[PDB]
RNA sequence: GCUGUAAGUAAGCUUUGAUCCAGAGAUUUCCGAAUGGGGAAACCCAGCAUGAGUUAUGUCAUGUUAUCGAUAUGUGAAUACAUAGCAUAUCAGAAGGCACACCCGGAGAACUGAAACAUCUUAGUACCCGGAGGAAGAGAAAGAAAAUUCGAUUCCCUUAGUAGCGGCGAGCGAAAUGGGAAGAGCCCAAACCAACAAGCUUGCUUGUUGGGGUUGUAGGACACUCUAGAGUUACAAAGGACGACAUUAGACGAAUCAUCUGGAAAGAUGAAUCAAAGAAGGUAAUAAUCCUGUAGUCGAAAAUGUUGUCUCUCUUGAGUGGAUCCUGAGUACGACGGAGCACGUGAAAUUCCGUCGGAAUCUGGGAGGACCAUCUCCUAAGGCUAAAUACUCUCUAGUGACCGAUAGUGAACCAGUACCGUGAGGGAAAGGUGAAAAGCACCCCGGAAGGGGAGUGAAAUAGAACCUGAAACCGUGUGCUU
RNA sequence: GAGUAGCGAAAGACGGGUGAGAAUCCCGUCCACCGAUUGACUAAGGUUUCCAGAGGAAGGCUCGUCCGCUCUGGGUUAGUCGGGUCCUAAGCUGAGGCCGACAGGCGUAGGCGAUGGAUAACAGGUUGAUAUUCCUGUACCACCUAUAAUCGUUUUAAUCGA
RNA sequence: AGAUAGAAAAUAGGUGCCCGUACCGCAAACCGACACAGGUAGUCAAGAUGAGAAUUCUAAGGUGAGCGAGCGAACUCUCGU
């Protein structure tokens, strides 16, 4: 726990623009709440977060060849830490 | 059945009465590639991994039913049996004594 | 709707006519509600009038 | 490689598992950032954590059986 | 050697025994009987306890918290005792699912047949529900028979489409005898009781504690006299301790070479060989001798069915009198109304159910197709019971004058899927390059799709929509016609 | 049948550009239509059709360089908005209970259930896609901790309450 | 009714979870098999004229309707005299 919920970071032009500010973006597990993400990040990176925002993305249709499928459901959290710097190197 | 690196003769295909050392086994399809057997002419296209290309002459696989081990004493085509040396299934040329398969 | 003593319950059969025309019918027990001594503490339950002919204590 | 794990004291097994969590998280994180180039180096730690938890279970089965 | 299908390119793992294959164990998210409350299943919201966290709050983790049952204690109304009722604790007690099969019950059609139709038939069928068990039902004579009893039950053949029942129409339709499969009899009440727990004054008595003995040669107590094998499939009922084959991985396993045609031979030709193996499938064509195997033999750490025993656990066996006593009550049986039995409240005797009545106790009771008298047989109204018998969701091995893609399953192929419908439901079409992917390097026209060379291949009118490639149909030439 | 019927209400013209190709795509000018709406919101429903690049087989009743099409990569941020959280109606369920051939039906206490009641955030900026959600400004509602300027038998109080 | 030695007061610090949020929504993304002349609750809804949410033109803002180019016969359809 506190490491199993941060699945991956999110890198993209909008995430990059957020990183211009102190907002960092992560791909978190689908069964967590804002408080738990705050705790986990401030536990790992030793940062002090000010706020965090969560959103749930629906499974998207993806056809691979002749077989249709669905992508996995996603839950994304945005942190806006004050002091500190999650480095994604 | 034969081993990964022994020397065998071929009895099927355009290649018969010819020796050569085995280079791959692929036991999931019982097809071996022997050296200098089934020479192939494959047209490879200029890509990124392969800068250019051409007509490669690689070896293709043949069914294990088309090859045979040689008697290490008399180069005589032979079958292969087994004997339990210290409980170990070691091989015999079935017309003479022990046959060595080290590489 | 059974008796707590005998077990006399209802049963099906046929109402037959003069022309032997058949319709389904039923035959019920003469079940009467009586306060008897079920396991000591008195209780009201259905009991047939043939089981009350001789043997039951109200 | 579960011999020395049986030889371990059952108290740093938690420490070993926690370090394995840490290293797996770091390496996966730098995979999604496109800086890993060592794929067999994920499955091996998954092996390691799996074995470490199996040994941990077998350890506590003892007192359940004995007591 | 491997990292499934699935190709790949990537990082790797492996002779230090991995990979794989079996046995065993551990992990086993969420929903669902769904069970902490709720709910549009795979989602929300909690109580309690204990821990993590935080200065604290928020937050999190793991137990626990449904309803019934039974058992056990608390407490305890209207009411005085006492009962409801409440409140706890415990318990692998119950729920749900399914094999579209088989079985036993509860309930119960209709089209149809009668060349109409109502009795009757379809039919105690279909469909519903409730139980099950691997089998179930039935079962040790109130049974057939005029016997000399197969001496329990069932099931197979025949009796026999007979006897019979039938608006005596349609049509239903036995049983006994005999021949076989199977080779099982077993316990409780009742009398009575040494002793004891309780009301009685030990005179009478109560009891489940237990003994007692369970049957028609009439059995048992009774009184005499007498004497210490069973079995967990009924016949009480538990479980360690040794073996024995078999089954959920496997191992060994005989004997062929040459030429010819070929793209390749297993074919043809010649010469051999093995066979407890010439079952079968592969292999570049048609193989007993090339491969996987086959006959034969061998083989389990383990976890199972199974079985020999050794334990173990149980424990009375008879006779003779026969004075008394006992032998299954609202029962048999009768009346009314219904069902069942091949047989239509009827002789329904045989037999059940509802409603009223309602018996005998061996010096008795029931049956022998209205029936009786006599004879013969039996002994009800309590219980248990394996085998022969029915069936196949499975698993294992194998078989087929069974189908070979409009067939055979609906489904040989991501099929109960496209799709259709609000839903119950309904439901398809669709296999085949080659031996090997060798899946067509380059060049030419074109934006590309295509093509034309060259090359691969035996073959490319085998180029991926790919084996053979018919007809309808559409074209391009033309010999003879108009 | 036949190169026949049909091409699904309507106003287009032209210059420039793009491309293998243009009445049909992009830009511009002019013209025209709606304007209690073909305009702006927001529900129900559909689920990715949303945005940026790229493509042109197929789908668009023609064409197509275009698109609600195809390929790749992206995009939905709330203590205050609407719900959960709070309440209940109609109905639906319903422990015990009543009735029922089985199945089950009914029903009390109690629950569920908005289309209603009660509830604290406004303006501006902002990208290709979001914004009472993000950011700037200023607020408000609950809750907790530290402190309190003395409320004062802790029965009453500063004041705690079914 | 009870319950209790406590915090209100004039501050200063912190904490505030799950779900929905794209897009269409008189529509080529919905119900009509279709890029269908039908149906689809509610809110805002300007100017001139008027009593008016009527009518004609227009503003804000959208749009030119997924086939066209000719010729202007018969015959149908819609419209005027």
Helix D13-32 and helix D40-66, axial crossing angle in degrees, nearest 10: 150
Q: Which residue has the tokens 């799996």?
A: D50
CA D59 – CA D67 distance, rounded (Å): 13
> Domain tally for chain A?
1
Number of folded domains that form chain D: 1
Whole-Å CA distances, B38 to A54, B1, B14, B91: 62, 20, 8, 28
DSSP per-residue codes, D1-67 = -HHHHHHS-SSSHHHHHHHHHHHHHHHHHHHHTT----SHHHHHHHHHHHHHHHHHHHHHHHHHHH-
Structural domains of chain B, count: 1
Chain D: closest CA distance from residue A40 (Å): 13
Sign of the alpha-carbon dihedral angle for B15, B20, B26, B28: positive
Q: D21: which chain A residues are within 8 Å (Cβ-Cβ)?
A: 3-4
CB contacts of A44 in chain D (<8 Å) are 25
| Tokens matching residue B47 | 């890509």
Smallest Cβ distance to A3: which of D25, D30, D35? Answer: D25
Q: Where are the beta strands (DSSP E) in chain B?
A: 7-11, 16-24, 31-34, 42-44, 54-56, 62-63, 67-69, 81-85, 88-92
Domain that holds residue D46: 1-67
Method by which the coordinates were obtained: cryo-EM
Q: Closest nucleotide to A34's CA, by C1' atom?
A: G17
Q: What values do phi and psi take at D28, rounded to 5?
A: -65, -45
- H helices of chain B, in order, are none
**Helix or strand or coil: residue A38?**
helix
Q: What CATH number is given to the structural domain containing A36?
A: 3.30.70.330
Distance, first Cα to last Cα, chain B:
15
Quick count: other Cβ atoms within 10 Å of Cβ B90? Answer: 13
Other beta carbons within 10 Å of A10: 20
Domain that holds residue A81: 1-89
DSSP 3-state of A13? helix
- Contact between the CB of D39 and strand E at under 7 Å: yes
Q: How many CB atoms lie within 10 A of CB C51?
A: 21
Residue given tokens 């993209």 in the structure block: A12
Written as six digits, the tokens of B93 are: 């040329």
């Amino acid at each position: 726990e506190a490491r199993d919920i941060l699945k991956r970071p999110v890198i993209t032009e909008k995430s990059s623009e957020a990183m211009a500010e102190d907002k960092y973006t992560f791909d978190v597990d689908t069964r967590v709440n804002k408080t738990q993400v705050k705790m986990a990040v401030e536990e790992i990176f030793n940062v002090k977060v000010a706020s965090v925002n969560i959103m749930n993305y629906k499974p998207k249709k993806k056809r691979m060849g002749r077989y249709q499928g669905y992508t996995n459901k996603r839950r994304k959290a945005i942190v806006t830490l004050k002091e500190g710097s999650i480095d994604l190197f | 059945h034969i081993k990964k690196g022994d020397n065998v003769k071929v009895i099927a295909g355009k290649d018969k009465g010819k020796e050569g050392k085995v280079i791959a086994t692929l036991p999931k399809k019982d097809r071996v590639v022997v050296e200098g057997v089934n020479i192939m002419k494959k047209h490879q296209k200029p890509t990124q991994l392969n800068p250019e290309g051409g007509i490669l002459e690689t070896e293709a696989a043949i069914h294990v039913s088309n090859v045979q081990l040689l008697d290490p004493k008399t180069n005589e085509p032979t079958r292969v049996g087994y004997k339990f040396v210290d409980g170990k299934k070691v091989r015999i040329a079935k017309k003479s004594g022990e046959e060595i398969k080290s590489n | 709707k059974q008796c707590f003593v005998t077990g006399r319950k209802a049963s099906t059969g046929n109402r037959r006519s003069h022309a032997l025309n058949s319709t389904k019918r039923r035959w019920n027990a003469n079940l009467q509600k009586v306060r008897i001594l079920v396991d000591g503490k008195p209780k009201k339950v259905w009991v047939s009038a043939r089981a009350l002919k001789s043997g039951k204590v109200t | 490689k579960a011999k020395e794990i049986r030889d371990l004291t059952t108290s740093e097994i938690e420490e070993q598992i926690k370090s394995s969590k840490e290293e797996l998280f770091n390496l996966r994180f730098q995979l999604a950032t496109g800086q890993l180039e060592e794929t067999a180096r994920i499955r091996t730690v998954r092996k390691t954590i799996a074995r470490l938890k199996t040994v941990a279970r077998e350890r506590e089965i003892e007192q359940s059986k004995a007591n």
